[PDB]
Structure 1
Amino acid sequence: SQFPYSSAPLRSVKEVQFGLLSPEEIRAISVVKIEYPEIMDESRQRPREGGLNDPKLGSIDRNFKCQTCGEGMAECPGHFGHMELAKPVFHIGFIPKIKKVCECICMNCGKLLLDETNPTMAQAIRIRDPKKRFNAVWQLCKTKMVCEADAPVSRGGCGNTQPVVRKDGMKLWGTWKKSRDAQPERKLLTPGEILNVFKHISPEDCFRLGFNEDYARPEWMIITVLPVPPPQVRPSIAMDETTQGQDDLTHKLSDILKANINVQKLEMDGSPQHIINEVEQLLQFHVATYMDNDIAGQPQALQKSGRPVKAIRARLKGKEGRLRGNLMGKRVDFSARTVISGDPNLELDQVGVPISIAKTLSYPETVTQYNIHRLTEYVRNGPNEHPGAKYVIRDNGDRIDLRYHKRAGDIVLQYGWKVERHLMDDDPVLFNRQPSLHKMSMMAHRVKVMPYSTFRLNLSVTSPYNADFDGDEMNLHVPQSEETRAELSQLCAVPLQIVSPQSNKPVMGIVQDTLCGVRKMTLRDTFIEYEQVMNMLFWVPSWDGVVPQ
């Protein structure tokens, strides 16, 4: 309900289909063509149209709306642009696979070196998994070193000898045994040659090789048009009050576009092959390092400060990468952290919460006819008096802040509204200590608001948490819904976790001076007078009011 209304139906993802992007699709989904290396028009606001900061790509400024969708910064997802490459270049992530495919097929007729006549080849084709199918087909066709123009009847081959391909950085060398020993020639396999060879692969051969005709076509592994991500992917940062800093991806895209312009200019004017080779190799290097800057066997691309460029591949790997650092585990709202202390006078499933933390955190309670009076009282009390409230949320989703409202007493609550009231007693909250070695390290307690600034625990629960009070800190997470509150109170509650499934024995017991005192108190020669017995009996909450003889 926090999102503006959209008439499109709301559904959930059921399948993720992977594949490569065809140049046709890249051109189709694009909204603008990027050609001018200058980021800024004239350093007078209004970034140059057709440049790397075109307003059609999306908006990252509060007062500027996207020129493509018309939505604000909070709603615009960003729109892609495309950059046409003067000469096709290798995709750095697919070079070994490109080499394998070149080994599997003939470089002239564009057909497989083996056919279903071979029983082993038919057996390999019979398998289902594309990766294992390709592995088997490569293991077979690797040995076959000559194309056959005749059946081993014409099989469709051209009879040419198949070259042997070797990898060297981003370049592939193909060595032909041209016609005992003679002079063989090894010549460079340019990306364009491989591309126009791959375009002639039949769909049946493509399927036999493990590629998919609809989604992953082999010639799409060579980049001919580059997609330019929106500024949302590469946001700029204001280093100081005046000068903002371009992102690493923006600088790399500027370098790539400059190289493209250089190649285009050189091609039309005059063509010394040495210069063409140098400039095209520079373009290949820039495109490769834009997506992977840890290519072993060659120096990395460096910034002007000397630090290596943060390629897109580096964004996704490691503890701090996308998957581990932002998707599997992320920072969350509605949480608190402070030092823990012990309280002998707390029930097992109770946690003592400071007043300031109780005021800061909140729980949105729906206004009904069972609690409208109490919620109106909370709204009147305001965000500084306990019990109180912080916000009132209407049905449409608008939030009314009670700090900046001059007419808080002039607010009437309608059924279905939400009041973000303060944290109160007996609210279930999840409580956690790191490292979370087992599932008893996260348990749900009941809130009890107390003075002073430390979380307070019954000392029996210090065993499952592996916690003591010499400076440890623990995390508290507040559920924000009725469903989540029910889950916490019915599944993770402390009483339900007393017996562990690891060794079918309790994880909580009497500990420390309570254990010492129950040993001392139950000795055979410990006798208690009447007046002390009365006090000791009154202390038991469950005592039934009958004193034993």
Structure 2
Amino acid sequence: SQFPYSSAPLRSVKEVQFGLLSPEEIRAISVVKIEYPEIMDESRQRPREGGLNDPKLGSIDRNFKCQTCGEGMAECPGHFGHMELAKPVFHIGFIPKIKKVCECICMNCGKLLLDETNPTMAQAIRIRDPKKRFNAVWQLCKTKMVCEADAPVSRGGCGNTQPVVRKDGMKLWGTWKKSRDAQPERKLLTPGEILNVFKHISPEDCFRLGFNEDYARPEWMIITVLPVPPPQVRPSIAMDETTQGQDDLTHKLSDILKANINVQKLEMDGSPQHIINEVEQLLQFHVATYMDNDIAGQPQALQKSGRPVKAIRARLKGKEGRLRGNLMGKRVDFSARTVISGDPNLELDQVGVPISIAKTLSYPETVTQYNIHRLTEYVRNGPNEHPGAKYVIRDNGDRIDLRYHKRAGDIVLQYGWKVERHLMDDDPVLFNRQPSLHKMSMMAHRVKVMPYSTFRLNLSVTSPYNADFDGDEMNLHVPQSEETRAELSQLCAVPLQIVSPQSNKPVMGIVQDTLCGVR
């Protein structure tokens, strides 16, 4: 409802397909090329196009509408931008997998070290699971020390003894034992070299290795074009009002851009194979850090403050991360927290709500013939008087703030409209105590507005909450629809939780003074 209309049909997701991003697709979806490292045009507003703050990416300020989609803060989801890397670089997360893939295939012919002739692999291919099949294939291929030139009818092999490779941090060392004994001429497997190797792999080995032609194509495990997230993903913090600081991602992206430009400038002049090496390793380092900043056995990139950087992996992991910080759990609206107090004169499922909270929280209500008069009375009562309403919502979603509407007498409700009345008697409202060990730790009560500023409970229902009136606090979550009210009333009503499925016994009972009195 609150969303503006769209002609596109609305549906619900059903399947999420993973996979890597092909460079050509990256280019296709990007709307601009990011080349200039300095974010700001001339320190006089209108940041420079071609830089990290390109307005086509998406507007982040209210008064500017996105040059690409034409929407404001409401809808503009941020529009990617690509960036071309001069030199192919490893993708940090896929180093061990790339190592295993290289082991399983040839260095020159670029095919599996073995054919289907071997019965072990002949069976291994049949395994439907890509991951287990890959595990078996690696077990059966890492043994072969040499890529044979002849079928174990030439197999098309290279004949070169397949090198033994041992990972070293950000770099890969391949060890060859050349023809009885020779000097081991190991060397650093360059990302571009392996990329060119992978480009020649046929679909047969691809699928045999558990990969996919359309979605997971192995050479895509090496970075060539780095997409650039819009400003939304990396918004500009405001240390104090006017002065806005650069999010760590902004610094990291600008640094990678500078380094990439720098590599592009070595080839045109004296590049004595040692400036090239260190500089490209530096570029690899910033790329890896911007992708993850917790690599074992290596020092950690830092800001000039000395604090370690905020890599995306760090963002996602941890309790504070997205999954456990804003996806499963999230701070919600229409709640309240306060102190509790016993009150023997409340029925079991009732609950005392301080009047101020009742006046503050609100539950939308639709306008009908059965309530038109009552709702109109509420509206006349104003938001500062209880009972009374706070907002009126039109059929099209237009809101009315009754605080600033001096002309409330000039309002006549229309059927189908929605009124956010105060939290009135008999309403069903959830009620929780943290921690919520077991499902009895949170039930739905019936509201009964009372003065003073504490929630009130029937002394019996503490038992399930394991709560005492010595300063404990409990939360109150209000529904915001009619169905939700139905579920709360029918599934989470306190009376329906009297018997606990844990031990098929009653959970609440007579406690404290009532018990010692009845005895």
TM over 0.5: yes
Using the alignment, how far apart are the partners of 1:469 and 1:176 within structure 2? 75
Q: Which residue number in structure 1 is paired with residue 120 of structure 2?
A: 120
Give the Å deviation of 1:406: 1.3
Give the Å deviation of 1:507: 0.3
Runs of 4+ residues over 6 Å off in structure 1:
none
Gapped runs of 5+ residues in structure 1?
Answer: 517-548
Give the Å deviation of 1:270: 2.4
Describe the superposition over 1:128-187 as per-residue Cα deviations: whole angstroms up to 9, x where unpaired.
Answer: 100001000000000001111211111121211111111111100011111233211111
Give the Å deviation of 1:113: 0.6
Describe the superposition over 1:277-299 as per-residue Cα deviations: whole angstroms up to 9, x where unpaired.
Answer: 01000000000000110000110
Q: Which moved more, 1:445-454 or 1:159-168?
A: 159-168
Give the Å deviation of 1:126: 1.0
Give the Å deviation of 1:351: 0.3
Describe the superposition over 1:331-351 as per-residue Cα deviations: whole angstroms up to 9, x where unpaired.
Answer: 000000100001000000000
Using the alignment, how far apart are the partners of 2:158 and 2:446 within structure 1? 80
Give the Å deviation of 1:495: 0.2
Gapped runs of 5+ residues in structure 2?
Answer: none
SS state at 1:496 partner: helix
Using the alignment, how far apart are the partners of 2:8 and 2:242 within structure 1? 42
Pairwise CA RMSD? 1.2
SS state at 1:133 partner: helix
Using the alignment, how far apart are the partners of 2:498 and 2:219 within structure 1? 61
Give the Å deviation of 1:304: 0.4
Q: Which residue number in structure 1 is paired with residue 131 of structure 2?
A: 131
Higher alpha-carbon Rg: 1
Question: What does residue range 316-331 of structure 1 map to in structure 2 within 5 Å?
Answer: 316-331=316-331
Using the alignment, how far apart are the partners of 2:405 and 2:298 within structure 1? 63
Give the Å deviation of 1:99: 0.3
Give the Å deviation of 1:317: 0.6
Using the alignment, how far apart are the partners of 2:268 and 2:163 within structure 1? 33
Using the alignment, how far apart are the partners of 2:6 and 2:242 within structure 1? 39
Using the alignment, how far apart are the partners of 1:269 and 1:391 within structure 2? 69
Q: Which residue number in structure 2 is paired with residue 92 of structure 1?
A: 92
Residue 401 of structure 2 is aligned to residue 401 of structure 1: yes
Using the alignment, how far apart are the partners of 1:240 and 1:371 within structure 2? 49
Give the Å deviation of 1:440: 0.4
TM-score, normalised relative to structure 2: 0.99
Using the alignment, how far apart are the partners of 1:413 and 1:267 within structure 2? 74
SS state at 1:463 partner: helix
Give the Å deviation of 1:426: 0.3
SS state at 1:180 partner: coil
SS state at 2:226 partner: strand
Q: Which moved more, 1:408-417 or 1:234-243?
A: 234-243
The aligned length equals 517
Q: Which moved more, 1:125-134 or 1:264-273?
A: 264-273
Describe the superposition over 1:500-545 as per-residue Cα deviations: whole angstroms up to 9, x where unpaired.
Answer: 00000000000001000xxxxxxxxxxxxxxxxxxxxxxxxxxxxx
Using the alignment, how far apart are the partners of 1:270 and 1:182 within structure 2? 35
Give the Å deviation of 1:268: 1.8
Using the alignment, how far apart are the partners of 2:101 and 2:367 within structure 1? 65
SS state at 1:67 partner: coil
Using the alignment, how far apart are the partners of 2:156 and 2:181 within structure 1? 29
Using the alignment, how far apart are the partners of 1:157 and 1:185 within structure 2? 20
Describe the superposition over 1:232-277 as per-residue Cα deviations: whole angstroms up to 9, x where unpaired.
Answer: 0000011113311010000000000000000001112222100000
Using the alignment, how far apart are the partners of 1:125 and 1:253 within structure 2? 42
Using the alignment, how far apart are the partners of 1:4 and 1:349 within structure 2? 40
Question: What does residue range 274-353 of structure 1 map to in structure 2 within 5 Å?
Answer: 274-353=274-353
Describe the superposition over 1:87-115 as per-residue Cα deviations: whole angstroms up to 9, x where unpaired.
Answer: 00000000000000000000100110111
Give the Å deviation of 1:326: 0.3
Describe the superposition over 1:214-243 as per-residue Cα deviations: whole angstroms up to 9, x where unpaired.
Answer: 100000000000000000000001111331
TM-score, normalised relative to structure 1: 0.94
SS state at 2:204 partner: helix
Residue 63 of structure 2 is aligned to residue 63 of structure 1: yes
Q: Which residue number in structure 1 is paired with residue 432 of structure 2?
A: 432
Using the alignment, how far apart are the partners of 2:486 and 2:275 within structure 1? 71
Describe the superposition over 1:23-64 as per-residue Cα deviations: whole angstroms up to 9, x where unpaired.
Answer: 011001101000000100001111110101100111110101
Using the alignment, how far apart are the partners of 1:124 and 1:311 within structure 2? 38
Q: Which residue number in structure 2 is paired with residue 202 of structure 1?
A: 202
Describe the superposition over 1:386-424 as per-residue Cα deviations: whole angstroms up to 9, x where unpaired.
Answer: 100000000110110000001011001000000000000
SS state at 1:364 partner: strand
